[model samples]
Target: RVTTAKLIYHELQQQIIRMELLPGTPLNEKALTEKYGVSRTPVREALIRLAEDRLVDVFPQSGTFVARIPVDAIPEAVVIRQALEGETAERAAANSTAAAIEKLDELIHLQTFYARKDKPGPFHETDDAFHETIAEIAGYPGIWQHLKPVKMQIDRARRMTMPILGRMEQVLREHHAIRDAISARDVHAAREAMKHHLSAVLPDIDELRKSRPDYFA
Candidate 1:
């Protein structure tokens, strides 16, 4: 049921998160029209959708452009996700079934393997699955749907952090803490571990801003 417009939106969104479409890069309607082999209408529609996600900005006369990393927006998004996801992890710890734990263990193992290989693509996939699995186990998959747009902003920063030396291994360690706490049904430990993992991005954002000033807004 994916329309051409939706497909374009997803494509652009991924590029934005991956920094393929660098922040503040001009979004030329004509270029996109030709790039996707689509008409102007769908191109414009996709841009509008991205704008709603705060990933694109369309000014009155200046045309559309990819939004900057909103330095301030990153922390706000992190705070929101930390509070919400932390609660979800705690609830999962309390309610998760044996099967749920097994699924998480599988994801962690996959994440570790990919991390060791320095494969960001598969590693990030498994990373997302780890969190999404906890949300589903907590009976709040809709919460993840609601959080997606906000998390997209955080995702840009995460992508930037992935290449830093030893970062992936640290992430694996944190994931283990979260997974172990949940597996043991320790609600307090689960919540704190999730909070710790989510908070790790704030310092990285500061470092990234200094390291790559052009990438931020």
Candidate 2:
């Protein structure tokens, strides 16, 4: 059914975004066709859409595989993210209420709890909620949706950075700085904090590339 195709697409997309389906892992169409209980038609259709998203590659004589990180695209992604997230933080600082700031505090606390337990999955979930909450408080929830795919392009590097010693604690500190700026209604400070927080991934990507050069294209 049509729903099966959509389900497969989203599930596969998440796995790829989370780096569970590592770069260049072959996507066996017949295997997917069997696993999803759908015919080749739906599997091929799902793959076509993923290809359009740049998450999958199709070759003339070769099979489909997960796309490698486009190392060259990382800088541009960081710039665009900083621009959008900085403005969002500024708006939140200018417009935030006590209630909105409290919600952000709660997310930060949850992130800290997960990090203390060394649970990256839950930590990442809170990380996302914290960012999306900023966008919502800024009165532009749609911006987060628009950034999803673009963020996906950078996510592998981000995920790779998460387990580095003290990285999650550093993220918590960054979140606290952003929260403090917004809670204090310091728009300029909030913008700078948010931009710096999101921009941390560039150096992380460089270090990650040093260890796993094959993952970069």
Candidate 3:
């Protein structure tokens, strides 16, 4: 069964990304207790986990608060993601199975359709599935798993930065480019494609930091 603390943690994470909670808003444990009807232990644990990932800041006496995206950290995160993405693409190109390629094709098509529909939530999910598929195809399922929690934290910063960048169309094109490269069995092209795709976030990160001062630390 799902615990209230987990529920509260996910809900609050969503709220932060959606800008409902915003940056620097104080989190009151008693309020969370009253709101979710749970004990303090789970809530504390949840916050501890998030804080460990740098998404929450647990202050000494001031209480917990949603962390502001550290602008400096954005560059490092992007670099790290790109390195992993490039490696995944290379591995996938060299060892991708027929079934994996088929699954990727299906996901890409579905993503294209959803993106054209301008449905962010569904499109975003497809986008995630696409990357995870690549990682799996490359025999690095754990790469995706290891990156997931960290990626979610980055997703928050992504939204905070490029809230309306209309990135869907661009992403669709990148997907096709990446798919074609992988289908051709060109590891170098695949690596380049992945690097390009991963690096695309840097531009948006720059724009976001400039446009949204309230969301940054």
Candidate 4:
């Protein structure tokens, strides 16, 4: 049933995307079947879905691997996201509401708590909320929906980027700046701050690529 397959697929997806499985980690069909207590058919079905997500490389006669993050594709995704999200930030500033600012404030502090606990999944979700909240405030809820697939591509690397020293602190500072600008209705400042904030993932990616060369496609 797809229910079993979806459960298995999503469980494995997060483990891989969170890098708990790491890039190139071998996946044995036998192992997965055992792990999920599922039939081989469900395990196989799950692997096929993961392959579609580009999270696993299923090679014939060789083995399955948690596919390397496609580092080269990041720039294009980032370019498109920044362009779209920057506009969202400008619009959010223009349409700033008191409740929106309060919600944004709560989201920012939640990131602080999540970061303190070193919980990347929680932190990542909160980060999503922060951005989604901005898009909502911008009166462009659909904008965040459009960015979903693009964000998916970057998330694994982002989870990796979490432990880079000063990164959380940097993110908090950036969030505060953007939130402040939006709260103050500073359109250009909101746009530029969001642009600069999103760019945080770029510079460290080179270092990550070199450090874990095998992790890149």
TM-score of each: 0.93, 0.96, 0.87, 0.88
Model 3: per-residue Cα lDDT over 1-217, one tens digit each: 7877778778877776555677788888788877777788877877887787677788887889988877777777777788888888999988867777899999988987876676677777788899998998888988987776556546766554332656787788898888888878899999999989887777776777777777777
- lDDT of all predictions: 0.88, 0.90, 0.78, 0.88
Error of 2 at 214 (Å): 1.5
TM-score for candidate 3 = 0.87
Per-residue lDDT tens digits of candidate 4, residues 15-122? 887778988789999987887786999889889988987889988889998998887789998989999999999999999989999999999889999888877678
The predictions' CA RMSDs to the true structure, in order, are 1.7, 1.4, 2.5, 2.2
**Which one is best on TM-score?**
2
In angstroms, the error of model 2 at 45 is: 1.2
- Residue 35 in candidate 4, Cα distance off native in Å: 3.0
Q: In candidate 3, which residue ranges exceed 4 Å CA deviation?
A: 1-20, 59-61, 160-166
| Model 2, span 104-172: residue lDDT tens | 999998999999999988898789899999999999988888788888878878788888899999999
Best-matching candidate per lDDT: 2
Cα deviation at 110, candidate 3, in Å, is: 1.7
Window of ten residues with lowest summed lDDT in model 2: 1-10
TM-score, candidate number 4 = 0.88
Candidate 1, 1-217: lDDT as tens digits: 9999999989999999877888878999998899888789999888988888888888879989888878877888888999999989999999878999899999988988998888987788788888999999988987777788888877888888987899989999999999899989999999999999999999998998899997787
